[PDB]
Protein backbone atom coordinates (compact mmCIF):
# COMPACT_ATOMS: atom_id res chain seq x y z
CA UNK A 1 0.00 0.00 0.00
CA UNK A 2 2.97 2.33 0.51
CA UNK A 3 3.21 2.81 -3.20
CA UNK A 4 -0.44 3.59 -4.12
CA UNK A 5 -1.94 7.07 -3.85
CA UNK A 6 -5.72 7.32 -3.56
CA UNK A 7 -7.25 9.94 -5.83
CA UNK A 8 -11.10 10.01 -6.08
CA UNK A 9 -13.64 7.26 -5.11
CA UNK A 10 -14.79 5.64 -8.32
CA UNK A 11 -17.58 3.54 -6.90
CA UNK A 12 -18.58 1.70 -3.76
CA UNK A 13 -20.01 -1.76 -3.59
CA UNK A 14 -20.48 -4.35 -0.90
CA UNK A 15 -17.44 -5.02 1.21
CA UNK A 16 -16.08 -1.53 0.72
CA UNK A 17 -15.28 1.46 -1.47
CA UNK A 18 -13.41 1.88 -4.74
CA UNK A 19 -10.69 4.38 -5.57
CA UNK A 20 -8.92 5.51 -8.74
CA UNK A 21 -5.27 5.44 -7.73
CA UNK A 22 -1.75 5.91 -8.99
CA UNK A 23 1.44 4.16 -8.28
CA UNK A 24 4.12 6.59 -7.18
CA UNK A 25 6.95 4.46 -8.59
CA UNK A 26 5.83 3.50 -12.06
CA UNK A 27 3.02 5.93 -12.74
CA UNK A 28 0.55 3.16 -13.47
CA UNK A 29 -2.99 4.29 -12.83
CA UNK A 30 -5.15 1.74 -11.09
CA UNK A 31 -8.44 0.91 -9.41
CA UNK A 32 -8.32 -0.36 -5.82
CA UNK A 33 -11.21 -2.27 -4.17
CA UNK A 34 -10.97 -2.45 -0.38
CA UNK A 35 -12.75 -5.64 0.72
CA UNK A 36 -13.26 -5.55 4.52
CA UNK A 37 -12.46 -8.48 6.81
CA UNK A 38 -13.27 -7.33 10.39
CA UNK A 39 -12.21 -10.91 11.22
CA UNK A 40 -13.87 -12.78 14.13
CA UNK A 41 -16.57 -13.27 11.45
CA UNK A 42 -16.05 -15.77 8.64
CA UNK A 43 -12.61 -14.78 7.48
CA UNK A 44 -12.43 -14.11 3.84
CA UNK A 45 -15.73 -13.44 2.15
CA UNK A 46 -16.68 -16.33 -0.07
CA UNK A 47 -17.57 -13.72 -2.67
CA UNK A 48 -14.07 -12.29 -2.58
CA UNK A 49 -12.77 -15.79 -2.75
CA UNK A 50 -14.43 -16.40 -6.01
CA UNK A 51 -13.63 -13.07 -7.63
CA UNK A 52 -9.99 -13.41 -7.08
CA UNK A 53 -9.47 -16.93 -8.15
CA UNK A 54 -11.89 -17.13 -10.96
CA UNK A 55 -10.23 -14.02 -12.21
CA UNK A 56 -6.80 -15.63 -11.76
CA UNK A 57 -7.65 -17.65 -14.80
CA UNK A 58 -9.42 -15.13 -16.97
CA UNK A 59 -6.70 -13.29 -18.85
CA UNK A 60 -8.37 -11.78 -21.97
CA UNK A 61 -8.40 -8.35 -23.76
CA UNK A 62 -12.10 -8.10 -23.05
CA UNK A 63 -12.03 -8.77 -19.31
CA UNK A 64 -10.87 -6.41 -16.74
CA UNK A 65 -7.39 -7.29 -15.45
CA UNK A 66 -6.61 -8.18 -11.82
CA UNK A 67 -3.20 -6.68 -11.16
CA UNK A 68 -2.48 -7.83 -7.68
CA UNK A 69 -4.02 -8.68 -4.36
CA UNK A 70 -2.80 -7.27 -1.16
CA UNK A 71 -4.11 -9.54 1.60
CA UNK A 72 -3.04 -7.71 4.65
CA UNK A 73 -4.21 -8.41 8.17
CA UNK A 74 -6.94 -5.76 8.23
CA UNK A 75 -8.41 -5.50 4.77
CA UNK A 76 -7.97 -6.92 1.29
CA UNK A 77 -7.33 -4.65 -1.64
CA UNK A 78 -7.90 -5.93 -5.11
CA UNK A 79 -5.83 -3.91 -7.54
CA UNK A 80 -7.35 -3.45 -11.00
CA UNK A 81 -6.40 -1.94 -14.34
CA UNK A 82 -8.10 1.38 -14.73
CA UNK A 83 -10.61 2.00 -17.37
CA UNK A 84 -12.36 5.25 -18.29
CA UNK A 85 -16.06 4.66 -17.48
CA UNK A 86 -18.77 1.99 -17.53
CA UNK A 87 -21.36 1.52 -20.25
CA UNK A 88 -24.02 3.12 -18.09
CA UNK A 89 -22.37 6.55 -17.81
CA UNK A 90 -21.34 6.46 -21.45
CA UNK A 91 -24.91 5.54 -22.43
CA UNK A 92 -26.10 8.58 -20.47
CA UNK A 93 -23.86 11.00 -22.35
CA UNK A 94 -25.41 9.57 -25.50
CA UNK A 95 -28.87 10.43 -24.16
CA UNK A 96 -29.65 12.41 -27.37
CA UNK A 97 -26.88 11.30 -29.72
CA UNK A 98 -27.72 7.61 -29.64
CA UNK A 99 -24.71 5.36 -30.01
CA UNK A 100 -23.84 4.87 -33.66
CA UNK A 101 -24.70 1.41 -35.04
CA UNK A 102 -21.06 0.55 -35.85
CA UNK A 103 -19.72 1.51 -32.42
CA UNK A 104 -22.51 -0.59 -30.86
CA UNK A 105 -21.68 -3.49 -33.09
CA UNK A 106 -18.08 -3.23 -31.93
CA UNK A 107 -19.23 -3.22 -28.38
CA UNK A 108 -21.41 -6.32 -28.51
CA UNK A 109 -18.76 -8.28 -30.48
CA UNK A 110 -16.16 -7.65 -27.80
CA UNK A 111 -18.49 -8.49 -24.95
CA UNK A 112 -19.40 -11.63 -26.71
CA UNK A 113 -15.69 -12.16 -27.25
CA UNK A 114 -15.02 -11.98 -23.59
CA UNK A 115 -18.17 -13.83 -22.74
CA UNK A 116 -17.40 -16.92 -24.74
CA UNK A 117 -13.92 -16.99 -23.17
CA UNK A 118 -15.43 -17.22 -19.67
CA UNK A 119 -17.76 -19.80 -20.80
CA UNK A 120 -14.90 -21.70 -22.25
CA UNK A 121 -13.31 -21.63 -18.89
CA UNK A 122 -16.30 -22.90 -17.03
CA UNK A 123 -17.29 -19.52 -15.45
CA UNK A 124 -20.71 -17.91 -15.25
CA UNK A 125 -20.69 -14.23 -14.82
CA UNK A 126 -24.25 -13.96 -13.52
CA UNK A 127 -24.28 -10.13 -13.29
CA UNK A 128 -23.85 -8.66 -16.73
CA UNK A 129 -25.14 -5.09 -17.02
CA UNK A 130 -23.94 -1.67 -18.23
CA UNK A 131 -22.51 -0.45 -14.92
CA UNK A 132 -20.62 -3.57 -14.68
CA UNK A 133 -18.87 -3.16 -18.09
CA UNK A 134 -16.01 -0.70 -18.71
CA UNK A 135 -14.91 1.04 -21.91
CA UNK A 136 -11.65 2.85 -22.60
CA UNK A 137 -11.10 5.89 -24.75
CA UNK A 138 -9.83 3.62 -27.40
CA UNK A 139 -12.91 1.77 -28.46
CA UNK A 140 -12.59 -1.21 -26.24
CA UNK A 141 -15.06 -2.67 -23.81
CA UNK A 142 -14.37 -5.07 -21.00
CA UNK A 143 -16.28 -7.28 -18.60
CA UNK A 144 -15.87 -6.53 -14.95
CA UNK A 145 -17.36 -7.23 -11.49
CA UNK A 146 -16.85 -11.00 -11.12
CA UNK A 147 -18.02 -10.56 -7.61
CA UNK A 148 -21.02 -12.70 -8.31
CA UNK A 149 -19.51 -15.39 -10.49
CA UNK A 150 -18.98 -19.11 -10.02
CA UNK A 151 -17.16 -21.91 -11.67
CA UNK A 152 -19.51 -24.30 -13.29
CA UNK A 153 -19.27 -27.96 -14.17
CA UNK A 154 -20.69 -30.32 -16.71
CA UNK A 155 -23.31 -31.04 -16.58
CA UNK A 156 -24.34 -28.41 -14.04
CA UNK A 157 -25.81 -28.67 -10.59
CA UNK A 158 -28.37 -26.42 -9.09
CA UNK A 159 -26.64 -23.12 -8.14
CA UNK A 160 -27.69 -19.97 -6.30
CA UNK A 161 -31.03 -18.73 -7.12
CA UNK A 162 -30.92 -15.12 -6.03
CA UNK A 163 -28.88 -14.16 -9.03
CA UNK A 164 -28.54 -11.45 -11.72
CA UNK A 165 -29.71 -7.81 -11.43
CA UNK A 166 -33.44 -7.64 -11.98
CA UNK A 167 -33.75 -5.91 -15.30
CA UNK A 168 -31.27 -8.27 -16.90
CA UNK A 169 -32.44 -11.61 -15.36
CA UNK A 170 -33.56 -14.45 -17.66
CA UNK A 171 -36.91 -16.06 -17.66
CA UNK A 172 -35.58 -19.42 -16.53
CA UNK A 173 -34.44 -17.79 -13.34
CA UNK A 174 -37.61 -15.78 -12.90
CA UNK A 175 -39.74 -19.00 -13.17
CA UNK A 176 -37.54 -20.75 -10.64
CA UNK A 177 -35.96 -23.63 -12.55
CA UNK A 178 -33.75 -26.22 -10.93
CA UNK A 179 -30.89 -25.53 -13.32
CA UNK A 180 -29.53 -22.55 -15.20
CA UNK A 181 -26.36 -22.09 -17.11
CA UNK A 182 -24.56 -20.03 -19.72
CA UNK A 183 -27.69 -18.91 -21.40
CA UNK A 184 -28.26 -16.59 -18.43
CA UNK A 185 -25.29 -14.50 -19.40
CA UNK A 186 -26.62 -14.21 -22.96
CA UNK A 187 -30.07 -13.09 -21.94
CA UNK A 188 -28.19 -10.33 -20.23
CA UNK A 189 -26.08 -9.45 -23.17
CA UNK A 190 -29.19 -9.43 -25.29
CA UNK A 191 -30.86 -6.91 -23.06
CA UNK A 192 -27.76 -4.83 -23.00
CA UNK A 193 -27.58 -5.16 -26.72
CA UNK A 194 -31.12 -3.87 -27.12
CA UNK A 195 -30.39 -1.11 -24.66
CA UNK A 196 -27.52 0.27 -26.61
CA UNK A 197 -29.91 0.45 -29.48
CA UNK A 198 -32.56 2.59 -27.79
CA UNK A 199 -30.77 4.00 -24.68
CA UNK A 200 -33.58 2.82 -22.38
CA UNK A 201 -33.71 -0.48 -20.46
CA UNK A 202 -35.47 -3.14 -22.48
CA UNK A 203 -37.43 -4.70 -19.61
CA UNK A 204 -37.10 -2.49 -16.47
CA UNK A 205 -39.29 -4.30 -14.06
CA UNK A 206 -39.91 -3.34 -10.47
CA UNK A 207 -40.44 -6.96 -9.41
CA UNK A 208 -40.10 -10.62 -10.27
CA UNK A 209 -43.64 -10.75 -11.67
CA UNK A 210 -43.51 -7.41 -13.44
CA UNK A 211 -40.17 -8.38 -15.05
CA UNK A 212 -41.91 -11.43 -16.19
CA UNK A 213 -44.84 -9.41 -17.45
CA UNK A 214 -42.62 -7.07 -19.26
CA UNK A 215 -40.86 -9.91 -21.05
CA UNK A 216 -44.09 -11.58 -21.93
CA UNK A 217 -45.63 -8.46 -23.35
CA UNK A 218 -42.69 -8.10 -25.69
CA UNK A 219 -41.93 -11.64 -26.64
CA UNK A 220 -45.31 -13.14 -26.19
CA UNK A 221 -46.32 -15.40 -23.35
CA UNK A 222 -44.39 -18.63 -23.64
CA UNK A 223 -46.34 -21.79 -24.34
CA UNK A 224 -45.35 -25.45 -24.67
CA UNK A 225 -44.56 -25.17 -28.26
CA UNK A 226 -42.02 -22.41 -28.04
CA UNK A 227 -40.58 -23.53 -24.74
CA UNK A 228 -41.41 -27.20 -23.94
CA UNK A 229 -41.67 -27.36 -20.16
CA UNK A 230 -42.69 -23.81 -19.19
CA UNK A 231 -46.09 -24.91 -17.82
CA UNK A 232 -44.41 -27.19 -15.38
CA UNK A 233 -42.06 -24.60 -13.97
CA UNK A 234 -42.24 -23.87 -10.25
CA UNK A 235 -43.31 -20.21 -10.50
CA UNK A 236 -45.36 -20.49 -13.61
CA UNK A 237 -49.00 -19.64 -13.14
CA UNK A 238 -51.55 -20.84 -15.73
CA UNK A 239 -53.37 -17.60 -15.11
CA UNK A 240 -50.64 -15.61 -16.81
CA UNK A 241 -52.14 -13.19 -19.31
CA UNK A 242 -51.20 -14.43 -22.75
CA UNK A 243 -49.78 -11.71 -24.88
CA UNK A 244 -48.73 -12.03 -28.45
CA UNK A 245 -45.16 -11.59 -29.54
CA UNK A 246 -44.41 -8.10 -30.87
CA UNK A 247 -42.75 -7.19 -34.17
CA UNK A 248 -39.04 -6.58 -33.64
CA UNK A 249 -39.20 -3.49 -35.90
CA UNK A 250 -41.48 -1.99 -33.25
CA UNK A 251 -39.22 -3.21 -30.48
CA UNK A 252 -35.90 -2.49 -32.15
CA UNK A 253 -36.57 0.05 -34.91
CA UNK A 254 -32.98 0.94 -35.81
CA UNK A 255 -31.75 -2.68 -36.10
CA UNK A 256 -31.58 -4.09 -39.59
CA UNK A 257 -32.61 -7.56 -40.58
CA UNK A 258 -29.40 -9.13 -39.21
CA UNK A 259 -29.23 -7.36 -35.86
CA UNK A 260 -32.81 -8.24 -35.52
CA UNK A 261 -32.17 -11.96 -36.08
CA UNK A 262 -29.25 -12.13 -33.63
CA UNK A 263 -31.14 -10.27 -30.91
CA UNK A 264 -34.10 -12.48 -31.20
CA UNK A 265 -31.81 -15.44 -31.07
CA UNK A 266 -30.14 -14.04 -27.97
CA UNK A 267 -33.54 -13.85 -26.18
CA UNK A 268 -34.95 -17.17 -27.09
CA UNK A 269 -37.13 -18.46 -24.32
CA UNK A 270 -35.91 -22.04 -24.28
CA UNK A 271 -32.46 -21.82 -22.77
CA UNK A 272 -31.55 -24.89 -24.66
CA UNK A 273 -32.12 -23.14 -27.94
CA UNK A 274 -30.65 -19.73 -27.09
CA UNK A 275 -27.71 -18.68 -29.16
CA UNK A 276 -24.29 -19.11 -27.54
CA UNK A 277 -21.44 -16.66 -27.52
CA UNK A 278 -19.46 -18.78 -29.79
CA UNK A 279 -22.31 -19.10 -32.23
CA UNK A 280 -23.07 -15.44 -31.72
CA UNK A 281 -19.62 -14.25 -32.51
CA UNK A 282 -20.38 -15.68 -35.92
CA UNK A 283 -23.75 -14.32 -36.79
CA UNK A 284 -23.90 -12.56 -40.18
CA UNK A 285 -24.62 -9.47 -38.13
CA UNK A 286 -20.92 -9.20 -37.45
CA UNK A 287 -19.62 -9.80 -40.94
CA UNK A 288 -18.62 -6.18 -41.29
CA UNK A 289 -17.76 -5.12 -37.81
CA UNK A 290 -14.87 -2.72 -37.30
CA UNK A 291 -13.37 -0.92 -34.29
CA UNK A 292 -14.70 2.68 -34.00
CA UNK A 293 -13.41 5.01 -31.35
CA UNK A 294 -15.98 6.35 -28.91
CA UNK A 295 -16.88 10.02 -28.59
CA UNK A 296 -15.50 11.52 -25.35
Amino acid sequence: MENFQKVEKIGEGTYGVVYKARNKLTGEVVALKKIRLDTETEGVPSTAIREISLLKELNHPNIVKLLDVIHTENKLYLVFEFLHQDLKKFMDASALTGIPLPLIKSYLFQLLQGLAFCHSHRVLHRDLKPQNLLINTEGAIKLADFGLARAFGVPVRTYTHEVVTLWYRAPEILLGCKYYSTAVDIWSLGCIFAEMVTRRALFPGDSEIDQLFRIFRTLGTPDEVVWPGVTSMPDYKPSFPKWARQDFSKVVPPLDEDGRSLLSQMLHYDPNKRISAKAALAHPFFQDVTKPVPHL
Binding site: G13, T14, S46, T47, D127, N132, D145, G147, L148, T160, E162, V163, V164, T165, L166, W167
Partner: peptide, 7 residues
Protein backbone atom coordinates in the same frame (compact mmCIF):
# COMPACT_ATOMS: atom_id res chain seq x y z
CA UNK B 1 -32.53 0.75 -10.17
CA UNK B 2 -32.10 -2.63 -8.46
CA UNK B 3 -28.78 -3.52 -6.92
CA UNK B 4 -26.95 -6.86 -7.30
CA UNK B 5 -28.34 -9.86 -5.40
CA UNK B 6 -26.25 -10.47 -2.28
CA UNK B 7 -25.10 -13.49 -0.33
Amino acid sequence: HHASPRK
